[PDB]
Amino acid sequence: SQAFQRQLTALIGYDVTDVSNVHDDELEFTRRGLVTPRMAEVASRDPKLYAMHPWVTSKPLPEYLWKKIANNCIFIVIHRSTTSQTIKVSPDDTPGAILQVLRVCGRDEYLVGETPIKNFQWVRHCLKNGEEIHVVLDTPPDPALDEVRKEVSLWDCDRKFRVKIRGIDIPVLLTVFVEANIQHGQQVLCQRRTSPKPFTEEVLWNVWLEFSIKIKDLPKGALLNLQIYCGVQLLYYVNLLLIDHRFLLRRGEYVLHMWQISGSFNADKLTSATNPDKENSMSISILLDNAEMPNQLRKQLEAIIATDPLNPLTAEDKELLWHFRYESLKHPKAYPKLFSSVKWGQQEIVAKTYQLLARREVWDQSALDVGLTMQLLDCNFSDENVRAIAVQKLESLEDDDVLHYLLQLVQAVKFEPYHDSALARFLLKRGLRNKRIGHFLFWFLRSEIAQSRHYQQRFAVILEAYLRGCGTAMLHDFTQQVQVIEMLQKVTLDIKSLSVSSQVISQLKQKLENLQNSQLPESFRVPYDPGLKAGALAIEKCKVMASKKKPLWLEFKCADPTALSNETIGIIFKHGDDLRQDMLILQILRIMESIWETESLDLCLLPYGCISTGDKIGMIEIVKDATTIAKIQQSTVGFKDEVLNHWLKEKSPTEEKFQAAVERFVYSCAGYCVATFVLGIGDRHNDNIMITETGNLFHIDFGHIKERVPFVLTPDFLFVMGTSGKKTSPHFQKFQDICVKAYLALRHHTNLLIILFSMMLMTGMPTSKEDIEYIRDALTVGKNEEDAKKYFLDQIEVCRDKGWTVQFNWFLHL
Numbered sequence: 001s002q003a004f005q006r007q008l009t010a011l012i013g014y015d016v017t018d019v020s021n022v023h024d025d026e027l028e029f030t031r032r033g034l035v036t037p038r039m040a041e042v043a044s045r046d047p048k049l050y051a052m053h054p055w056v057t058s059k060p061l062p063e064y065l066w067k068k069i070a071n072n073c074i075f076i077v078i079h080r081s082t083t084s085q086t087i088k089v090s091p092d093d094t095p096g097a098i099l100q101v102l103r104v105c106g107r108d109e110y111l112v113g114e115t116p117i118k119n120f121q122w123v124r125h126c127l128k129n130g131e132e133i134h135v136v137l138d139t140p141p142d143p144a145l146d147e148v149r150k151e152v153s154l155w156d157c158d159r160k161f162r163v164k165i166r167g168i169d170i171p172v173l174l175t176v177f178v179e180a181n182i183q184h185g186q187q188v189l190c191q192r193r194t195s196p197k198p199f200t201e202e203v204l205w206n207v208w209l210e211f212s213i214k215i216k217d218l219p220k221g222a223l224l225n226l227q228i229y230c231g232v233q234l235l236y237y238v239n240l241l242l243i244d245h246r247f248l249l250r251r252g253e254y255v256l257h258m259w260q261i262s263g264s265f266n267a268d269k270l271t272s273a274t275n276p277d278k279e280n281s282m283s284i285s286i287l288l289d290n291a292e293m294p295n296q297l298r299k300q301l302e303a304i305i306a307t308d309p310l311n312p313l314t315a316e317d318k319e320l321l322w323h324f325r326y327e328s329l330k331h332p333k334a335y336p337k338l339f340s341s342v343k344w345g346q347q348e349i350v351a352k353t354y355q356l357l358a359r360r361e362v363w364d365q366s367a368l369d370v371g372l373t374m375q376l377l378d379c380n381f382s383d384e385n386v387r388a389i390a391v392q393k394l395e396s397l398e399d400d401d402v403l404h405y406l407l408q409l410v411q412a413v414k415f416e417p418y419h420d421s422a423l424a425r426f427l428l429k430r431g432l433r434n435k436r437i438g439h440f441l442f443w444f445l446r447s448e449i450a451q452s453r454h455y456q457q458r459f460a461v462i463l464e465a466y467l468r469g470c471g472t473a474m475l476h477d478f479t480q481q482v483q484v485i486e487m488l489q490k491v492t493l494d495i496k497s498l499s500v501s502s503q504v505i506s507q508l509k510q511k512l513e514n515l516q517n518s519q520l521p522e523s524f525r526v527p528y529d530p531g532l533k534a535g536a537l538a539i540e541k542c543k544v545m546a547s548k549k550k551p552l553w554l555e556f557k558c559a560d561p562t563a564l565s566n567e568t569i570g571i572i573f574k575h576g577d578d579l580r581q582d583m584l585i586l587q588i589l590r591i592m593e594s595i596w597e598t599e600s601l602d603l604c605l606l607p608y609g610c611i612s613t614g615d616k617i618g619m620i621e622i623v624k625d626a627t628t629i630a631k632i633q634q635s636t637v638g639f640k641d642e643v644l645n646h647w648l649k650e651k652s653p654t655e656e657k658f659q660a661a662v663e664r665f666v667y668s669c670a671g672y673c674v675a676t677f678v679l680g681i682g683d684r685h686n687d688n689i690m691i692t693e694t695g696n697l698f699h700i701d702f703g704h705i706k707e708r709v710p711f712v713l714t715p716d717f718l719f720v721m722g723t724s725g726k727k728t729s730p731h732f733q734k735f736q737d738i739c740v741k742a743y744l745a746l747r748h749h750t751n752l753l754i755i756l757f758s759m760m761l762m763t764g765m766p767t768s769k770e771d772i773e774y775i776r777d778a779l780t781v782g783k784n785e786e787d788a789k790k791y792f793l794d795q796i797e798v799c800r801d802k803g804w805t806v807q808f809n810w811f812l813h814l
């Protein structure tokens, strides 16, 4: 039965049994460790609701979706074979009560379980778009299809820490030296260097570097960071956990293959993986052989505790937090700063910190704050006990909320010192309790496994463990999806080599037909929208873009005869862009939408599906009935203020729907102006901005990132609102209205956005402190509501002063 592992390997894209690039058994130990959590979740998941995976939420239905309901009545069409009967229902009615199993027409999605109909996400999607709810009375799918295949005390050691640097070796290439840091978090506890030697293919020192920290004082999670400098500049780094996965001090002989720089806060610097490219890479050879507080002080403490996660703590600040430890422990918000005040290189202090962690009643009772929780999972905390109280708060997240934060919870595994962590186990568990979570976990993990040498090993092990409990059907499903993207990526990569396009449109359609009759299956799940199953290509409709990167525009029939639309499923396949950056930005746009929802604001963003599948390669969802702003301008002029406004007119049939497009545009434009300004990606050329035929503006192509402009509010955009250089219409006054409310609604979650932005830069954008601290300024940290309002409207006006000037400057450049 070893062909089951051979399968797993294929689904993963990496061989987890391979021990060709290890120097201990941490990886294998983690495989065995993950068995128990897997089975606990497997054995306790409800077979029925696992099969139907109701996508559901406990959040209230917002004001904007209440005022679309006809007096406590919502209509639901029901279909049998050629039947279409229409039942009246109240929002509070259950799938039990409305039944006089309802599956959604066209989709692999179910309205089942003890939930009111207003709390299913598919229902809310229908109310939002103005659409009506269509269902079939189907049999429940068989849970048997989901069957899972049958399976000296260290504190008595006063001697100083030392490491022997024997030397470095490189096959091919002034002078060079080795720096050896004892690190915890991004914090250097102790640092020693060698003397400089000439930089030859082999350099030997044969020297003991004796550190000032005692062996009894090395905290668990401490890394020996070995770096190589020339002159100075950093050229190579590698890490080694000083305390291993069995709580044993690391001992003996090491030859570690190192990573090279160029291609500084970057998550790759932290990895404990060695370079597997044994043949080209630099190696290093080492030997380990070993009353209560008064008023002004409270106010000073409260001011420290109130500051944003990127406000630096002085030595003075840290000393106050530590001395007033127990007062600080009463404020959940103090936690990141308090634990950044611990001297982790002193055992007796660490011990006190653990006694502090045992008194966390207020923490245990606090309401879940995701922003505060994520801060404890970032690069500044390497202690397992601190990180675990963060994961403990995650456990109360309902499934709707896991999905919102999933991409960034997977990225934050990169800040774990060990492969087996409470965070890895939380992701395993939540993924096996819910198919939608599991589907996306598969692809987020696979995305990293296929292109990150620094972390593929760790992520591979987590994914295997997921796959061994997701059950036979999901396995079949995953296999099918992977086969299709490998076929389609091949075709994408081949067409590209044949570089508008004449004999290429011939070649493309030949190859598609060739795949259609031969390799491509009956049907497959769309990776970015797991409820849709695509069938056979519409070869007629597929094309390649007049473009440097030559992406494929592909269109598919729907495999599901119960579907009530004729619409096709459109997927773009592209090589050339780093789509990891796009995934992170689009997910942050979804988080921004859910923030706005909490304050009854809809800004109609359009965060389309995107999945990185490999090195500079992946897929993008085709938004139907949409074109670019640049193209709309080419059409009428060959820049003019009015062309967008009457493009919108000629697509709207009735005056009823035109005005609807204009308002939808005012909202859309508001959302993207605020969102892009906060993320510092607002200055775009307008062939990276799109609009639907129904007025929904949306930015695209985020994985790319002179005079400046904060965002895009051009005269064509302004003209749709009714403003001509220096005027102010009703619709423009409303745009300002919405921008201001949207901006202030994001500032109420300042800490959350700062941590997500920080993490984003570090794990998906090869970064300095200067880069990270943009969003502080963008969110006008420290300022009041009225002063922030003035800031943003000044930005709105900075766009007005420039009209077309950056657009044209882009025109010349590009």
Ligand SMILES: C[C@H](Nc1ncnc2[nH]cnc12)c1cc2cccc(Cl)c2nc1-c1cccc(F)c1
Pocket: 543, 544, 545, 546, 551, 552, 553, 572, 608, 620, 621, 622, 623, 624, 626, 627, 628, 631, 687, 700, 701
């Ligand atoms: C720029 C435009 N982008 C998107 N179009 C539709 N949905 C999307 N989702 C994300 N990006 C797009 C686009 C991408 C293409 C990719 C491959 C092949 C072709 Cl022919 C592409 N064409 C466009 C495009 C360009 C102008 C107008 C238009 F409707 C589409």
